[PDB]
Design an enzyme around this catalytic site. Structure first.
Site, short mmCIF file in Angstrom:
data_model
loop_
_atom_site.label_atom_id
_atom_site.label_comp_id
_atom_site.label_asym_id
_atom_site.label_seq_id
_atom_site.Cartn_x
_atom_site.Cartn_y
_atom_site.Cartn_z
N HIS B 41 0.81 -1.22 0.00
CA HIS B 41 0.00 0.00 0.00
C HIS B 41 0.84 1.27 0.00
O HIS B 41 0.29 2.36 0.21
CB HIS B 41 -0.95 0.01 1.19
CG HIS B 41 -0.27 0.16 2.51
ND1 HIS B 41 0.09 -0.91 3.29
CD2 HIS B 41 0.14 1.27 3.19
CE1 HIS B 41 0.68 -0.48 4.39
NE2 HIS B 41 0.72 0.84 4.35
N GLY B 143 3.74 5.52 9.59
CA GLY B 143 5.03 5.32 8.97
C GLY B 143 5.79 4.10 9.45
O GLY B 143 6.92 3.88 9.00
N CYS B 145 4.83 0.95 8.99
CA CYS B 145 4.64 -0.18 8.09
C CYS B 145 5.94 -0.51 7.37
O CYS B 145 6.71 0.39 7.00
CB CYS B 145 3.53 0.11 7.09
SG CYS B 145 1.88 0.17 7.84
C1 LIG Z 1 1.58 1.91 7.76
O1 LIG Z 1 2.54 2.56 7.99
C2 LIG Z 1 0.31 2.10 8.58
C3 LIG Z 1 0.58 1.81 10.06
C4 LIG Z 1 -0.73 1.94 10.93
C5 LIG Z 1 -1.21 3.29 10.79
C6 LIG Z 1 -0.92 4.14 11.93
C7 LIG Z 1 -1.51 3.59 13.16
N1 LIG Z 1 -0.83 2.29 13.58
C8 LIG Z 1 -0.42 1.42 12.40
O2 LIG Z 1 0.12 0.38 12.57
N2 LIG Z 1 -0.74 1.21 8.12
C9 LIG Z 1 -1.93 1.76 7.52
O3 LIG Z 1 -2.04 2.94 7.41
C10 LIG Z 1 -3.05 0.85 7.04
C11 LIG Z 1 -3.09 0.79 5.51
C12 LIG Z 1 -3.94 -0.37 5.00
C13 LIG Z 1 -5.40 0.04 4.84
C14 LIG Z 1 -3.39 -0.91 3.68
N3 LIG Z 1 -4.30 1.39 7.55
C15 LIG Z 1 -4.67 1.11 8.92
O4 LIG Z 1 -3.97 0.45 9.60
C16 LIG Z 1 -5.96 1.68 9.48
N4 LIG Z 1 -6.74 0.66 10.14
C17 LIG Z 1 -8.05 0.28 9.64
O5 LIG Z 1 -8.50 0.80 8.68
C18 LIG Z 1 -8.85 -0.80 10.38
C19 LIG Z 1 -8.93 -2.06 9.52
C20 LIG Z 1 -9.90 -3.14 10.03
C21 LIG Z 1 -10.85 -2.62 11.10
C22 LIG Z 1 -11.34 -1.22 10.75
C23 LIG Z 1 -10.20 -0.20 10.76
C24 LIG Z 1 -5.57 2.71 10.53
C25 LIG Z 1 -6.67 2.88 11.57
C26 LIG Z 1 -5.17 4.04 9.90
#
Ligand SMILES: *C(=O)[C@H](C[C@@H]1CCCNC1=O)NC(=O)[C@H](CC(C)C)NC(=O)[C@@H](NC(=O)C1CCCCC1)C(C)C
Ligand SMILES: *C(=O)[C@H](C[C@@H]1CCCNC1=O)NC(=O)[C@H](CC(C)C)NC(=O)[C@@H](NC(=O)C1CCCCC1)C(C)C
Lengths: 306, 306
Positions: B41, B143, B145
């Site tokens: 992503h 950040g 990930c």
């Molecule tokens: C990558 O760097 C990032 C790390 C997250 C975001 C910051 C908070 N703690 C972390 O570990 N990952 C990221 O942004 C995810 C991208 C994917 C959608 C590909 N997004 C998320 O982790 C989001 N979580 C959700 O959307 C959940 C999924 C299942 C239940 C509903 C909500 C977060 C909340 C931004």
């Protein structure tokens, strides 16, 4: 989100660990430039540690009596000197993995990472705190002496602890990298009393701020308190007094959460007098005091290191 | 003595972390040989993550659209491919710090060390466990990930986890290094239900054995039990059933302490039904389930790594 007991990356310290053998006793050494630092009781036998005469034992030792091995390569010792409770073995080869480093003597209540080593090889890394009684609650077995505690600031490793001994209470005592012990301890196998421990109050408050940042807010009450009235209650539960300096250090956390320090002290006062009633904070049923305010802000803001 | 939450040395993994930037999204990558692995992503915008078409987004990307930086030196991408949920960026330079490594898919209940990174730079290291519901309780910010989970066996780093997302429950989900998620999760910002968690029973028993080795023995009672009667009680408190395989894995700890596994199960049964009455075990008021039997024996015997 989330909050974990987090230790510094150990890569810069891993490249400095060597094995130091003097007779039967083998322990770990810190290879910085062309000097290897290790606890001085490496020159002791098991019978010597009851009441050792270190200067007499060292005079009978020459450079070849110290077997220093970095991995599978043996380092030649070309000089030895004793500075307080540590030996300084000058080797003919300077460590090419030597990072930018600093020798610091930490204060009680501060935290650091320990790289547990055996035979000069790292076993694991964990975070520790210098207790108010100048001990640490680590994990050390036979042969762990020479393992060091450290902090990383930007790109500079601040060495602050070297392991020397364990007390039957289960706690551990050591020195700074200049050989001076933390607390009233001496490197001999004899009865030594460690003072009673105390809860690091400013660290508990920092931990409660971390809980608020992570969504654990049930313990926040509607009250405030004075710094004096809080310390009268905290003293009753073996908490260190909160100073105005500690209030200033909690400033960054107070502004990020919008919770005044004295408001959080009022919530901690209620937690001490009433307990948690079976509830947890950040997955803990007890109040954690091994996170500094700097540890909290670093983990909650993502501070990295070079 | 002493027992601490201990993570593997991170030096071998530190030399593999790079920064991967694609447009606005910047995250961490794993530089092994001439391939950089990172979550797919990274090619997404904030509006894409609601329902991303990864193949369509990647086709519009060429090699120059990926900015890979190792420290202060930029690595040139000469090819990109998508394997499940991870991107594989072929770079023109092979990482000279590449250690002996292995890609493994761990089982629930196993533990591993997480090296939290931001902008390709390590922030800290901590120990995690793969929960029965295929999540982990880590510490990740924006950040993070691309941060990886790993174990070290002798000299070989076994990469087993790469961080991808956080659920609003506070837990984290990710993939193995082949891009396959742990659990029924997908890399999109939509509602996803994580199954209810369960206490890892064999890990609690290993932790109780560690307590006995460290002198904490108050919880040992005079009773024994059958494997079936223990599982009937443990099931009531949301504990996983103890299998005979788990009993065999606890063999080394049982022989070192002279406490049969079913005898320790009888003590755990009493702890579950009666509580601790305000007492602690290894400094914990709750039962710990994030130490495998292998973690206990490694820390209690001092197993090192190359
Ligand atoms: C990558 O760097 C990032 C790390 C997250 C975001 C910051 C908070 N703690 C972390 O570990 N990952 C990221 O942004 C995810 C991208 C994917 C959608 C590909 N997004 C998320 O982790 C989001 N979580 C959700 O959307 C959940 C999924 C299942 C239940 C509903 C909500 C977060 C909340 C931004
Ligand atoms: C060095 O490798 C070693 C590490 C110890 C020993 C193993 C247990 N856990 C550790 O951290 N240190 C060591 O052997 C010490 C040598 C000094 C005497 C120079 N000895 C000890 O730590 C012993 N502890 C004591 O004698 C205490 C001192 C004060 C109170 C009375 C007992 C241990 C118990 C062997």
């Amino acid at each position: 989100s989330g909050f974990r007991k987090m230790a510094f990356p150990s890569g810069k310290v891993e490249g400095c660990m060597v094995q130091v053998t003097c007779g039967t006793t083998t322990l770990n050494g810190l290879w910085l430039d062309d000097v290897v630092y290790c606890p001085r009781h490496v020159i002791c036998t098991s019978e010597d540690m009851l009441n050792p005469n270190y200067e007499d034992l060292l005079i009978r030792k020459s450079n070849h009596n110290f077997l220093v091995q970095a991995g599978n390569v043996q380092l030649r010792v070309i000089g030895h000197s004793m500075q307080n409770c540590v030996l300084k073995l000058k080797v003919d080869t300077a460590n090419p993995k030597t990072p930018k480093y600093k020798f610091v003597r930490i204060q009680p209540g501060q935290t650091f990472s320990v790289l547990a080593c055996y035979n000069g090889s790292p076993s694991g890394v964990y975070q520790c705190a210098m207790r108010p009684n100048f001990t640490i609650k680590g994990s050390f077995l036979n042969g762990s002496c020479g393992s060091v505690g450290f902090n990383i600031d930007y790109d500079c490793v601040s060495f602050c602890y070297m392991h020397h001994m364990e007390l039957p209470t289960g706690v551990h005592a050591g020195t700074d990298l200049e050989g001076n012990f933390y607390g009233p301890f001496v490197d001999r196998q004899t009865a030594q009393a460690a003072g009673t421990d105390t809860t690091i109050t400013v660290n508990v408050l920092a931990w409660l701020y971390a809980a608020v940042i992570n969504g654990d807010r049930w313990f926040l009450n509607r009250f405030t308190t004075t710094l004096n009235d809080f310390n009268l209650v905290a003293m009753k539960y073996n908490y260190e007094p909160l100073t105005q300096d500690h209030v200033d250090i909690l400033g960054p956390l107070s502004a990020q959460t919008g919770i005044a320090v004295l408001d959080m002290c009022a919530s901690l006062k209620e937690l001490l007098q009433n307990g948690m009633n079976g509830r947890t904070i950040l997955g803990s049923a007890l109040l954690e005091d091994e996170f500094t305010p700097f540890d909290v802000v670093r983990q909650c803001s993502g501070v990295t290191f070079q």
